[PDB]
Ligand binder design. Structure first.
Ligand SMILES: CC(=O)O[C@H]1C(=O)[C@@]2(C)[C@H]([C@H](OC(=O)c3ccccc3)[C@]3(O)C[C@H](OC(=O)[C@H](O)[C@@H](NC(=O)c4ccccc4)c4ccccc4)C(C)=C1C3(C)C)[C@]1(OC(C)=O)CO[C@@H]1C[C@@H]2O
Ligand SMILES: Nc1nc2c(ncn2[C@@H]2O[C@H](COP(=O)(O)OP(=O)(O)OP(=O)(O)O)[C@@H](O)[C@H]2O)c(=O)[nH]1
Ligand SMILES: Nc1nc2c(ncn2[C@@H]2O[C@H](COP(=O)(O)OP(=O)(O)O)[C@@H](O)[C@H]2O)c(=O)[nH]1
Ligand SMILES: [Mg+2]
Lengths: 427, 253, 207, 431, 29
């Protein structure tokens, strides 16, 4: 089969992964004790993708919960679905990273990175045919970005063949909760470019706006944002777990979208999302889902797709729909907005259809778009970084922690080069 | 700044193909890199062929530099550190895909490579030729006469430099002998002794020439003093006789 | 990347620094090698290439450049041409020396993108060569003393020749302003004889 | 004693074959578990207990669709060894299907196909079902066709492919794989009947009066066409044409072996009840340009050869009258060097109706297979969609890194640069 | 620079806390 190892670092990654495991456990009919209780034979036909079996007919997730501080970990341990994990997989430090890329990457992270490399190696040898790794983290933190980049590098030099799929919470300009975000983000992008095959860029501001306008929530806490990100994660790999007319796995999706090795920064999105009030009036139809796909407000990255041409698009549907409908929808979307799609790639959109809809739904859909405009999301960072680095602000921390000075210049240069790469194909 | 070379031209492009192929063939590329080359192959490039050509073409610049994985990044770093001026018009992704339309520039880039190689050889031998000068020309400076203190100082400096060069060569030979787990300074000692004997012979010849010149100058100085005394006496006598003749002519006329 | 086994052992940095300062260098300080940079490393290449065999970089660079730096042709890219030639020939001469001392993995990135490990290995090779050269100089200082004595004797001979020439050039006269010779004396004698004949004829007429 | 072997490469082929085997099992009266409550000898071989096992081989590089076959209503129809699966799909990669992933399953599929061919006494050909647009359907089909042409160079091989549509294609790298599979669908094939998804969508929207066509309807219609082709070996009739005479009738030149398919009457229920089907009108509808299966207009091309398989009770004189009527019509233009362009076979067993299907019971039907130059207009379309990618070497790095050499792209395109002329030089008159 | 190497060596003579060179076979041959 196709088994994916799931890794998450930092408080953000731990919480997002906890919500993801809760979502897909409810999808697969698994109680917190691990005993199956669903009423569908199709839930366990391929449950081994996420759940490893054990005696008593119990299923334990393939999760590698890692952090440098046992706080959020001990929060998730006592949670509603916290017992489901393997207690050996709970790996933890004692001194937090303190929002340092150097501490989470070089010194504090190194003492623990072997204790997670051995665990992930054991998990990968415990499965049949590894498809890839699934990583959840954030680029603005200290343990998140640094430890995620360290693990990314170690896996790539240890598992070059498999695929590297990661979900990164890129920092946003407006919603800021840290004064050293640009440094860590710039340092993390360096490793993400050259050591990952596809990365989904996520901003907290975009999720907040989606909760404000689409869902029309009053006070959207972190639970709602992590719920949305978990829904996107499950939608990406729904093709592996369930049958359908068209089946697209991670390698298929990558070869569809990724045109060049260094252009793998995708904007994710989900549909249909509606507030609980207007959720009885509108009727679900494929053209409406495809229209909601390309709405500039439904994006999960704080950047406007209208500012640059799309490179490629992937659409993963769920339900029972005639495929003429969806294929004509994509043709209409492409030709009506022909200035938003590049000219030297005909048929930018790749479609997949899964037969089993989400529980409590008749129809759903996930959008993954590789577009040039994402370069905007980078220049802003490369401004702030520079706007600090010219004055050598806050450097002494990293430098005394063990980071050479030239590394910051190299990271800024590579960020600029990737911005130029994306802008090059825009015109 | 923009690109002034007409890479988009057609006859120019064919001419570039021509001398690039001639240079590539005359260095036995097909045997040393075991890859056949044709005009058609350079017309339609490929990833492996372009990478191999660039690798061979750069190894002629820095033979001690070794390649590794991540070929595109290595090529970009090489292009940067070669002090290349037109790099702002190139991008990493274009390097990753040589064969596209951007190839209309990329092949010309290789051309400059070849040109440097050509320029390189005009430099290369001359470096040895420089040492060749130190082997011969300075010796000629030691075999020429001296007529001023500056010339003698220059000759002494040249002799000291030659002695230092001989000592450095002997030390290098001894170090090379000692590198291979051995202690055999006998050839180095013999070379140093031969160089010292040659320097001593040159110094003796120069000293003999200087002594002969000094003796000739002293003899000429004595002769010049005698001739100056005689000339002063003759000039005084001639002036007195001319004055007497002028006075007598004035009195008689 | 090229790599070879070295006969000399790996040596740590601090006594390397102090001995490099003691022997001939002054820029080989602790922080200079502790922080690898292009400019300092290439300058160190310069001081060593002027050290061990004692001819300047600029002379060699100009003497390899003049044929392309002059007016053979008007094409504009001559300056970048010559700059690339400069960096490549520096690479190439450094490669000659480093293969002469047992290093066959040295390259151009060593000049312009140095790192601690390879630079310190090169410095260990440098110090072993410097110590062996110092031992050779201590053994062959007799030749240096003989050369110094020969130079002193040559200087004394040159001073004697200059003094002799100055003494020779101390003779001058109205007839013979180019130092006295036989021709000036003969001309003066002929003029005096003619004047004396005229005076004698005048005296005989007036007798 | 005739036999026919059917091969199904994963995504399109497995589903098309599932529809085909539904249709065959209904045709021969067999129950869907294989027990039967002659004609079936071509497709189904019997055992001692009365069970009939089909001569089918199901292949894929991912096991999900086969697992649907392995657990659907036909899990007992197949012998569990012809259901062959891989571990990871080719993932739209031609090199993965052909070079890297395919070669670990190619040995098993050849072994099983040889085992199946051993039981055949007079095997006539291979009915290979695949798709030009994917990774498995291009690469693995190319590798399998190479192996078969090496091992079975005499027997005919028929490919029933799914050519990518001009506009509604569902893959970013589809032109690459479609161009790459041409070298192996050109020389190692006998009669590859092209099919486009867009044309069958249009046919379902117009003739069948349905605007929500899933893949099931297209698979059912393709199964109907292939059953109409193979009906000559299963039932008697006034005129029967086997695969060898079929090729000798259609294909005029070795490289001009890309026929164009059409079926009639593709009609709904109410229209069938109100209409009164006649041989002349179904024959004319076979020539209707919007009824073709490839999005090309036959008016722009000249028909090379045509064969008509009349299923159901039809009298030959009516067929001759319809042929004369078609020849009199000036919209259908043939080529000068082919005076007699119509070859006709008639079978006495009318088409079956699948319960829950969309095609009503018709006492008669007709399948048209026409070799013509109009199909050339299809090729050029992909020759555009290929170029706009290869002009920038867009996705080449995804194939070169899997075992492919970049030049093999251009060479494949070069083959089209020849093949077009093979539909153009012969298009010119003799003088 | 007029600082002659031979003259400087003679003046210095008339290891700087070191040793007279070394030669050891490398283990990782
Ligand atoms: C009767 C019915 O339709 O129930 C729905 C529902 O009413 C609607 C309106 C739901 C509802 O969603 C929301 O209002 C919402 C709230 C916060 C954040 C996002 C959405 C629902 O909450 C969403 C929830 O949907 C699911 O459970 C999905 O399958 C989803 N599951 C979870 O998120 C989940 C989390 C924890 C435990 C169990 C399930 C999912 C989707 C894709 C992949 C995996 C899981 C359910 C049942 C409903 C409500 C409760 C009203 C809608 O959302 C979803 C995600 O389907 C809003 O528009 C859709 C359409 C649905 O019809
Ligand atoms: N007519 C028809 N075509 C189908 C059907 N299923 C898939 N296809 C075709 O398959 C094409 C997409 O190819 P893929 O999804 O990559 O499947 P594949 O060709 O086997 O390649 P892989 O996914 O690597 O196995 C589409 O363009 C469809 O035309 C079907 O049921 N009927
Ligand atoms: N999307 C999302 N973002 C979060 C969540 N929690 C924290 N963040 C953001 O992630 C950034 C990094 O914070 P943190 O997780 O403490 O960094 P770490 O120490 O490296 O793990 C902060 O700026 C937060 O705004 C969460 O639950 N969801
Ligand atoms: Mg497939």
């Amino acid at each position: 089969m196709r088994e994916i190892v799931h890794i998450q670092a930092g408080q953000c990654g731990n919480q997002i992964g906890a919500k993801f495991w809760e979502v897909i456990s409810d999808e697969h009919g698994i109680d917190p004790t691990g005993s199956y209780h669903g009423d569908s034979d199709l839930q366990l036909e391929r449950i081994n993708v996420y759940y490893n079996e054990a005696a008593g007919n119990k299923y334990v997730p393939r999760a590698i919960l890692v952090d440098l501080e046992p706080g959020t970990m001990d929060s998730v341990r006592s949670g509603p679905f916290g017992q489901i994990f393997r207690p050996d997989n709970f790996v933890f430090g004692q001194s937090g990273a303190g929002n340092n890329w150097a501490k989470g990457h070089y010194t504090e992270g190194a003492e623990l990175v072997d204790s997670v490399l051995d665990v992930v190696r054991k998990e990968s040898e415990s499965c049949d045919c590894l498809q890839g790794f699934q990583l959840t983290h954030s680029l603005g933190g200290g343990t998140g970005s640094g430890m995620g980049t360290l693990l990314i590098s170690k896996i790539r030099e240890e598992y070059p063949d498999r695929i590297m799929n990661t979900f990164s919470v890129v920092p946003s300009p407006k919603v800021s909760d840290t004064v050293v975000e640009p440094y860590n983000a710039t340092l993390s992008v360096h490793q993400l470019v050259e050591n990952t095959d596809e990365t989904y860029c996520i901003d907290n501001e975009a999720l907040y706006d989606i909760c404000f306008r689409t869902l029309k929530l009053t006070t959207p806490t972190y639970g709602d944002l992590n719920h949305l990100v978990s829904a996107t994660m499950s939608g990406v790999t729904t093709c592996l777990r369930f049958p359908g007319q068209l089946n697209a796995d991670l390698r298929k999706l990558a070869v569809n979208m990724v045109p060049f090795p260094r252009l793998h920064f995708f904007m994710p999105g989900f549909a249909p999302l509606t507030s609980r009030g207007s959720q009885q009036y509108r009727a679900l139809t494929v053209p409406e889902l495809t229209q909601q796909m390309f709405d500039a407000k439904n994006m999960m990255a704080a950047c406007d797709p209208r500012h640059g041409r799309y490179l490629t698009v992937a659409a993963v549907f769920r339900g029972r729909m005639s495929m003429k409908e969806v294929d004509e929808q994509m043709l209409n979307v492409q030709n009506k907005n022909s200035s938003y799609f590049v000219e030297w790639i005909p048929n930018n959109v790749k479609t997949a259809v899964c037969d089993i809809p989400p529980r409590g739904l008749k129809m759903s859909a996930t959008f993954i778009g590789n577009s040039t405009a994402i370069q905007e999301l980078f220049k802003r960072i490369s401004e702030q970084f520079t706007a600090m680095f010219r004055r050598k602000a806050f450097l002494h921390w990293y430098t005394g922690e063990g980071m050479d000075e030239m590394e910051f210049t190299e990271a800024e240069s590579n960020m600029n080069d990737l911005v130029s790469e994306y802008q090059q194909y825009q015109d | 700044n923009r690109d002034p070379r007409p890479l988009r031209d057609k006859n120019f492009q064919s001419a570039i193909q021509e001398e690039i192929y001639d240079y590539l063939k005359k260095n036995k590329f097909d045997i040393e890199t075991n890859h056949p080359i044709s005009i058609k192959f350079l017309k339609q490039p490929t990833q492996k062929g372009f990478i191999i050509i660039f690798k061979w073409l750069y190894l002629r610049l820095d033979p001690g530099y070794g390649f590794t994985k991540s070929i595109e990044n290595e090529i970009y770093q090489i292009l940067k550190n070669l002090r290349y001026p037109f790099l702002e018009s190139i991008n990493k992704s274009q390097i990753s895909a040589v064969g596209g339309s951007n190839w209309h520039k990329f092949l010309g880039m290789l051309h400059w490579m070849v040109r440097t190689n050509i320029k390189l050889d005009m430099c290369l031998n001359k470096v040895d030729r420089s040492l060749i000068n130190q082997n011969t020309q300075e010796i000629t400076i030691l075999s020429q006469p001296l007529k001023t203190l500056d010339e003698q100082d220059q000759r002494q400096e040249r002799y000291e430099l030659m002695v230092e060069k001989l000592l450095i060569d002997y030390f290098t030979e001894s170090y090379k002998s000692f590198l291979k787990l051995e202690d055999n300074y006998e050839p180095s000692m013999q070379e140093l002794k031969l160089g010292f004997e040659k320097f001593v012979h040159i110094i003796n010849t120069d000293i003999a020439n200087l002594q002969t010149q000094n003796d000739n100058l002293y003899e000429k100085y004595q002769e010049v003093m005698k001739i100056s005394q005689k000339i002063k006496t003759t000039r005084e006598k001639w002036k007195a006789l001319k004055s007497d003749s002028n006075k007598y002519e004035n009195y008689v006329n | 990347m090229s790599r070879n086994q070295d006969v000399f052992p790996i040596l740590d940095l601090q006594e390397l620094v102090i001995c490099l300062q003691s022997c001939d260098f002054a820029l080989a300080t602790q922080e200079n090698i502790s922080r690898p940079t292009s400019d300092y490393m290439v300058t160190l290449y310069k001081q060593i290439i002027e050290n061990f065999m004692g001819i300047s970089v600029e002379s060699l660079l100009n003497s390899s450049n003049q044929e392309t730096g002059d007016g053979h042709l008007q094409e504009e890219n001559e300056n970048i041409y010559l700059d690339t030639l400069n960096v490549l020939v520096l690479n190439k001469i450094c490669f000659k020396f480093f293969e002469n001392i047992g290093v066959q993995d040295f390259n151009m990135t060593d000049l312009y993108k140095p790192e601690a490990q390879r630079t310190q290995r090169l410095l260990s090779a440098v110090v072993n060569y410097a110590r062996f050269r110092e031992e050779r100089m201590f053994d062959c200082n007799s030749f240096i003393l003989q050369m110094e004595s020969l130079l002193g004797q040559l200087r004394s001979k040159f001073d004697d020749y200059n003094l002799i020439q100055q003494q020779l050039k101390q003779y001058e006269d109205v007839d013979g302003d180019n130092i006295p010779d036989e021709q000036e004396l003969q001309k003066l004698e002929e003029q005096n004889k003619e004047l004396e004949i005229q005076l004698k004829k005048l005296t005989k007429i007036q007798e | 004693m005739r036999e026919c072997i059917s091969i199904h490469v994963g995504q399109a082929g497995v589903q098309i074959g599932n529809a085909c085997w539904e249709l065959y099992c209904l045709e021969h009266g067999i129950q869907p578990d294989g027990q039967m409550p002659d004609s079936f000898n071509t497709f189904f071989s019997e055992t001692g207990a009365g069970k009939h096992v089909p001569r089918a081989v199901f292949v894929d590089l991912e096991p999900t669709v086969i697992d649907e076959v392995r657990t659907g209503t036909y899990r007992q129809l197949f012998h569990p060894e012809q259901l062959i699966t891989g571990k990871e799909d080719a993932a739209n990669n031609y090199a993965r299907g052909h070079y890297t992933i395919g070669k670990e399953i190619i040995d098993l599929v050849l072994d099983r196909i040889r085992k199946l061919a051993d039981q055949c006494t007079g095997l006539q050909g291979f009915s290979v079902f695949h798709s030009f647009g994917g990774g498995t359907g291009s690469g693995f089909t190319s590798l399998l066709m190479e192996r078969l042409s090496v091992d079975y160079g005499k027997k005919s091989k028929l490919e029933f492919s799914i050519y990518p549509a001009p506009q509604v294609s569902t893959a970013v790298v589809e032109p690459y794989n479609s161009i790459l599979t041409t070298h192996t669908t050109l020389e190692h094939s006998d009669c590859a009947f092209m099919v486009d998804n867009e044309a069958i969508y249009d046919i379902c929207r117009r003739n069948l009066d349905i605007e929500r066509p899933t893949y099931t309807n297209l698979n059912r219609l393709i199964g109907q066409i292939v059953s109409s082709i193979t009906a000559s070996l299963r039932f008697d009739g006034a005129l029967n044409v086997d695969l060898t005479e079929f090729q000798t009738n259609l294909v005029p030149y070795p490289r001009a072996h890309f026929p164009l398919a059409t079926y009639a009457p593709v009609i709904s229920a109410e229209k069938a009840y109100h209409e009164q089907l006649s041989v002349a009108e179904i024959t004319n509808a076979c020539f209707e340009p919007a009824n073709q299966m490839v999005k090309c207009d036959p008016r722009h091309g000249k028909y090379m050869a045509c064969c008509l398989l009349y299923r159901g009770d039809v009298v030959p004189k009516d067929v001759n009258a319809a042929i004369a009527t078609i020849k009199t019509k000036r919209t259908i233009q043939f080529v000068d060097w082919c005076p007699t362009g119509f070859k006709v076979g008639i079978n006495y067993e009318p088409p079956t109706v699948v319960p829950g299907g969309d095609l009503a019971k018709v006492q008669r039907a007709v399948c048209m297979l026409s070799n013509t130059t109009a199909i050339a207009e299809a090729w050029a379309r992909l020759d555009h969609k290929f170029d706009l990618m290869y002009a920038k070497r867009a996705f080449v790095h995804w194939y070169v890194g899997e075992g492919m050499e970049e030049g093999e792209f251009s060479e494949a395109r070069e083959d089209m640069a020849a093949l077009e002329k093979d539909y153009e030089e012969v298009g010119v008159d003799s003088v | 620079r007029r600082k002659s190497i031979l003259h400087t060596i003679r003046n210095s003579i008339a290891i700087s806390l070191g040793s007279g060179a070394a030669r050891v076979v490398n283990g990782p041959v």
